Structure 1
């Protein structure tokens, strides 16, 4: 009226006593409260959001008076649509704030006069907590009530004798209310209880009011299902619940997950659906994201759910061990054949291509299948456009092929690299049966971190002390008394060689008394070698002895993780459309209404036992 501050004070007080009779002035000087000058240009907040920001008991009863003023101007649309404009708070129509503070009365009013049921507040404040954001609810008033657990508000906004929103419209990030509902889901008891039933509530709502399609099918900007996003971020609770849930009332139960077939007393032939569980990379099946792309703190625990843990065994006892053993035996045979062709070669210089006789047919047949294994492991990794080692194998086999085609000297030098690297890769198969691959756990720590840094620091120690000793011969006159083979010299590094030979913890070097040759050199030498060769490696031995006790779940866990990785890539290697596992299921009307596919709606049957 007189300025932006005075009206802000009036409303923050909460009484129109200082606002009464201001509207005739507003109309007098054509002052449209819609005008922007009454907004602090730092963000753009107007009379209404500044008003609602202050709330006593949920009632600042000048608000309806202020809206009466807005209609005295004749304007609500421009008024009730005053989004915040900055990078911190962008958009955020007042309705968002009103819903946040949860006074269903002002909600009723604002919606009745009609603000909008859509305002995608994309201010960085509203991003997830990994993009500088503070709270990401879904940029939609409906989802804003959903995440904030205000069911009545949901019932009102979904349907009411006014404007109403459909959960159809996705966000500025591809998500609809379900995906958001999964985003801010958590694993604590509280952050599971309410969200569990709220999800089902809104799902049934969309079902009844849109009884043709389903909400679950809609995908985000990344094309993920809400179940998918549940899997990726590792939300145990909501996922564990969405995999079991079944719609009790058969009126519209055509979206349930768990079914029933028959209960002969204590045995229930329960039947779990599988429609986004496994298609081998055709629609981003959940098991894929569980096995390959998952680096999740809960990746292990989520696998403990029934229709996945069972599916492991299902894919195991069929097509699981057969091809695994076939591959391991063929690989061992190929490597022994390469060894064969290696040892039986013409030696003592001169490696040309000598294939002209019957006895050389053996080497020919070995090298052709060597190059065949090479091109096969090459094709294995080119389809990706222990995941590149078997490919570098092929690269070096092709180096060998070219060098032997040249048939010139210094060209068999890569055959040995191929053989040794292949027998290194022999560990790739040696991580399955008989609890093989336990080393593959400990090598994760010893090769990269522990033994690595230890050898680094010890090498630095010994080279520094080597410089020391090779500088410590002039006083304590030149003498390095013959070990228990460098003599006094100045050349470049022979010192280092013979000195390292000395540093070998081999024979408990001699003791001295009544010194004649270098006097203070020997005491330094002995104390140093005691330091480095009685403590350092013992430091590392104790480090081993303490670090080995870390295996708690990653024995059976890495065992079934091997199962997953191997078995699934095995399936991924040959035509899956062939008659495979994950058998069919019951027919239509109990196998229809696609979250997947045909009347069979392929499921698995687990036989549970319970008494009640």
Structure 2
């Protein structure tokens, strides 16, 4: 009859130790859901503790029936902001107790309760996100029996299209819990396939895969953005038997011996529609394993024709820039007849690149921030175009300082030509994690080298006593292999200066060689990719932007694929041909 006594009895699980409790509630006109009988700190109730210490449950729910409780404790919600929304039904699912779930559900437990507590959010610290619904909890915990019961119970079925606070459905929840681990991949893939099959039986008129959350992403799109390659590949290459044939995404058109042709569904993948998978992977994805996404069987083939169909435009862009840079060099060399025409093209060329580059940053601004190394050449083209236009502005507004900026724009313009080198093989090492590491060390090495160069130069000046600029330049000549080593006999500390100069020679050789050894270890501890995943990602990024068209002339995008009636249902599929000599259809004859 006491709050402390009630919680102690339910822990033991003996209903005989709790007698007259119902009579006590009637005498005091109090309910089990009242704040007096809750834990207070988090709103935890007697039922919640009973499920935690897993029979007393049935009498405890039975004595709710005697008292005139208007609110059912079976649907009680926690009040603490950390653990808000968690209910007794969630405990039974978490404890993997099918019998407790059946007992709870049969007594009017709500299956759509939202666990919107801070612990259930996608935090960076302690947390666990399984949608926000009891149905999602069972799906993410390998409980097919609980999922089956929650989907096929006459008391209160749980809807598969229910959404969390973020709009995530059950399929979305499986995506957010993926971790590309071999144990986790089997968990998500098996449950995702099972839910789809059960979804057709329960709700055949509702298409689960087209439901989008508050961000407007389908479960297939969500996997691409979040970087879950394991579930992404399974969804992208999915096939089923006859009963679940319309639920598949990969189909066989015809099979003539070893030759087999497959049709992949380009529903949300092809870049004809906005916010496609290709656009999401290349630009809206921040996961490190972005390159491994495009090497998938349907994506690898599809991106090839787009590159092949638009390879001429890529070289046309290269030719236009190469000719423009040649014009820039000639005008600059003779800057001090046709030279008047040349300056017009420089101003027009600079303003053309500037406006075109300004479009790119207007369409997308987060992409440069999230992945600087992916589109760092976009920044470089902006500086070259802005400075070229600014340099010609200083020519009209004569300030006699346009030449240093024009010369600086000339050398950087040729550097931007290295961007087009991504259209070829170029061997090297292809990695993004390594490149950031290598770039960081070289900049740090330069800072270390400069301070040592500056530190020794001041030491040389004071001991020998031009200034620091001449002395530092003399020391820097040692790297270019042009240093001066001589015993200056007209110095008081001639030996000390000579020994100090020799110390710098031995010091700089170690520093340069250490960077070479440090750079050598990265090459040795690098595994080459036979599919050239990094190179394909760069090509995929370029073709997606290039197919959008220039700023001055937008180009209509033609959908890639063929409309085929799978059977009815018509999907724009992609033809892929494969040869298999070990395994021994939609159409009737090969074509």
TM-score (norm: length of structure 2)? 0.87
Aligned residue among 145, 148, 155 for 1:152? 145
**Distance in 2 between the 1:245 and 1:443 partners?**
34
Superposed displacement of residue 98, structure 1: 1.4
Superposed displacement of residue 290, structure 1: 1.6
What are the within-5 Å matches in structure 2 for residues 234-273 of structure 1? 234-250=227-243, 253-273=245-265
Aligned residue among 469, 492, 511 for 1:536? 511
Give the corresponding residue for 2:5: 6
Give yes or no for the alignment of 1:65 onto 2:59: yes
CA deviation profile, 1:490-513 (whole Å, cap 9, x unmatched): xxx625524642664335624699
Give the corresponding residue for 1:388: 379
What stretches of structure 2 of length at least 5 have no aligned partner? 363-376, 585-591
Question: Does the 8 Å CA contact 1:90/1:122 hold for their aligned counterparts?
Answer: yes
SS at match of 1:216: helix
Give the corresponding residue for 1:353: none
Give the corresponding residue for 1:476: none
Aligned residue among 301, 305, 313 for 2:304? 313
Give the corresponding residue for 1:352: none
Superposed displacement of residue 40, structure 1: 1.8
**Distance in 1 between the 2:345 and 2:65 partners?**
87
Give the corresponding residue for 1:477: none
Question: Does the 8 Å CA contact 2:295/2:533 hold for their aligned counterparts?
Answer: no
Give the corresponding residue for 1:161: 154
What stretches of structure 1 of length at least 5 have no aligned partner? 56-60, 348-359, 473-479, 481-487, 593-598
**Distance in 2 between the 1:525 and 1:496 partners?**
18
**Distance in 2 between the 1:34 and 1:80 partners?**
9
What are the within-5 Å matches in structure 2 for residues 122-141 of structure 1? 122-130=116-124, 132-141=125-134
Give yes or no for the alignment of 1:552 onto 2:553: no
Change in 2 beyond 3 A, CA 1:326/1:519: closer
Aligned residues: 561
CA RMSD of superposed structures (Å): 2.9
**Distance in 1 between the 2:329 and 2:71 partners?**
83
Question: Does the 8 Å CA contact 2:38/2:46 hold for their aligned counterparts?
Answer: yes
Change in 2 beyond 3 A, CA 1:200/1:504: closer
SS at match of 2:254: coil
Give the corresponding residue for 1:607: 577
Give the corresponding residue for 1:42: 41
Superposed displacement of residue 550, structure 1: 5.0
What are the within-5 Å matches in structure 2 for residues 203-222 of structure 1? 203-222=196-215
Superposed displacement of residue 65, structure 1: 0.9
CA deviation profile, 1:556-588 (whole Å, cap 9, x unmatched): 23321221122221112258874746232313x
Superposed displacement of residue 541, structure 1: 3.3
Give yes or no for the alignment of 1:398 onto 2:389: yes
- Structure number with greater CO (CA < 8 Å, separation at least 6) is 2
Moved more, 303-312 or 549-558: 549-558
**Distance in 1 between the 2:76 and 2:287 partners?**
41
**Distance in 2 between the 1:445 and 1:244 partners?**
33
Moved more, 162-171 or 14-23: 14-23
**Distance in 2 between the 1:98 and 1:583 partners?**
49
Give yes or no for the alignment of 1:79 onto 2:52: no
Superposed displacement of residue 297, structure 1: 3.2
Give yes or no for the alignment of 1:461 onto 2:420: no
Superposed displacement of residue 327, structure 1: 0.8
TM-score (norm: length of structure 1)? 0.84
SS at match of 2:578: strand
What are the within-5 Å matches in structure 2 for residues 342-421 of structure 1? 342-345=332-335, 347=336, 360=337, 362-384=338-360, 385=362, 386-406=377-397, 409-421=400-412
